[PDB]
Structure 1
Amino acid sequence: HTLVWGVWVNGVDQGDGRNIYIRSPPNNNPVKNLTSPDMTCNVDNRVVPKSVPVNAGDTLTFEWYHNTRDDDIIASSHHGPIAVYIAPAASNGQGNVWVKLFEDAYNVTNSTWAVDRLITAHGQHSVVVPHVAPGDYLFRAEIIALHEADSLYSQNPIRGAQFYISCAQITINSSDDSTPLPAGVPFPGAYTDSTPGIQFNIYTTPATSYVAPPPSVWSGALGGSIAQVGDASLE
């Protein structure tokens, strides 16, 4: 159970984005239904009044929280991977539009899941803004908690992989469009019950065996990291 508070650009806090430049749902409940329109940008997908200006090569940092800003972020039980996707805003995230800019699942050196490192990072994870066409974009940040992912939601709706999905409205101003955005995957649609990484038993299967859901990260990406860029407590 987690939500996005706002974003940072190049290490500078853009301010509370909830229902402003983040298409925020009303609470931190997970999405579980892989076929639901809620997989696109969570349960209250609508245009919000602001879009954060960035340029290609900027660092865009999502900042998550549980109940209050810079708290425990997400329950430690929620081990799983983190991804970020981009699509053009004109799509409203419909169709084959979502391109992967970032993937982190399990780090063998540190023996940590992406979520574990997100807590240590005070909720902060980043991508580098790609050289796509200037214009309006949706950046879709996605945490998958696997603590009940031994079951499939489609079979047992009280269990399943949990998706914490947040869309940010991002305007790319300065870009040479040298890496134009390639075809995307649909959400809902890309993840199915047979997709690697959707059904997994984190209690019996070694984390080193985990494979995150495709698609792979676009070669055009520059992203990106799970790491604290800024100190929310100094505000």
Structure 2
Amino acid sequence: HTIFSSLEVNGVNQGLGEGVRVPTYNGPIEDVTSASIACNGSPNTVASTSKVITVQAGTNVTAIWRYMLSTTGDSPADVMDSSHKGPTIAYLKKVDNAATASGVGNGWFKIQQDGMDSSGVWGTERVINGKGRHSIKIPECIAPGQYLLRAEMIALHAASNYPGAQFYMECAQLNVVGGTGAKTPSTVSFPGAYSGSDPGVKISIYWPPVTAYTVPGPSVFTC
């Protein structure tokens, strides 16, 4: 139970729910076939925002995860419960207008993921114990313009069966400047990119102890 509730760019936090479409409820989406898997949604309620955040291509932005919209701190309990082990992931989608595009459908490409490292520590644990910070590189080689940024944490503590995996995501509204457009990513759809039978979605992280993990979705796009 967590919310990506603000974005930091060039060392500056852009504001609570400012350029990030935030729910007030911190509950997960558990149905990978729902339209809500793209940018959150029903049975949650997601606020709109007119702010579109300018970011230079080739630089990193930082999604800031918090337990609730009211959360002031950045200690582990202020981010997400430590039971919620799983990957962090981020995607972009080129859109006409980042303030109005829904995010549902094709066009997403993956730009970051952090599953389990060689010491057995999960991406979500780095966020939980790193002040809620989820660092994501905007590729240098994509076309400039309006994008949605979908940042996600998947909690797998209750994922032995499907439904079970808990998907926490929000979309930020970006204006990417300085992208060269040298490469056009292959894309996937939300809903569509994840299935309940994926080895990273239906997974007992305890029986047996997991030593390696396959993050769901496509390969990370690289320049």
Give the structure-1-normalised TM-score: 0.84
Contact kept, 8 Å, 1:191 with 1:213, in 2: the verdict is: yes
Report the residue type matching 1:2 in the other structure.
Answer: T
Q: Alpha-carbon deviation of 1:210?
A: 2.3
Q: What's the CA shift string for 1:190-235, capped at 9, x where partnerless?
A: 1112222010001113221322213111123xxxxxxxxxxxxxxx
Report the residue type matching 1:62 in the other structure.
Answer: A
Which residue is equivalent to 1:82?
88
Aligned counterparts, 1:37-116, within 5 A: 37-43=35-41, 44=45, 48-67=49-68, 68-69=71-72, 70-71=74-75, 72=77, 73-90=79-96, 92-109=102-119, 111-116=120-125
Which residue is equivalent to 1:32?
30
Which residue is equivalent to 1:5?
5
Contact kept, 8 Å, 1:40 with 1:93, in 2: the verdict is: yes
Q: Alpha-carbon deviation of 1:8?
A: 1.1
Q: Indicate the percent of aligned positions where both proteins have the same amino acid.
A: 40
SS at match of 1:57: coil
Q: Alpha-carbon deviation of 1:170?
A: 0.8
Aligned counterparts, 1:105-184, within 5 A: 105-109=115-119, 111-130=120-139, 131-153=141-163, 160-180=164-184, 182-184=185-187
Which residue is equivalent to 2:14?
14
Q: Alpha-carbon deviation of 1:184?
A: 1.1
Whole-Å Cα distance in 1 between the matches of residues 212 and 195 of structure 2? 19
Contact kept, 8 Å, 2:35 with 2:104, in 1: the verdict is: no
Q: Alpha-carbon deviation of 1:138?
A: 0.3
Whole-Å Cα distance in 1 between the matches of residues 84 and 102 of structure 2? 29
Give the structure-2-normalised TM-score: 0.88
Report the residue type matching 1:202 in the other structure.
Answer: I
Report the residue type matching 1:114 in the other structure.
Answer: G
**182-191 or 140-149, which deviates more:** 182-191
SS at match of 2:107: coil
Which residue is equivalent to 2:198?
195
Whole-Å Cα distance in 2 between the matches of residues 22 and 51 of structure 1? 9
Q: Alpha-carbon deviation of 1:94?
A: 2.9
SS at match of 2:214: coil
The root-mean-square deviation of aligned C-alpha atoms, in Å, is 1.6
Structure 2: state its 5+ residue gaps. none
Contact kept, 8 Å, 1:96 with 1:183, in 2: the verdict is: no
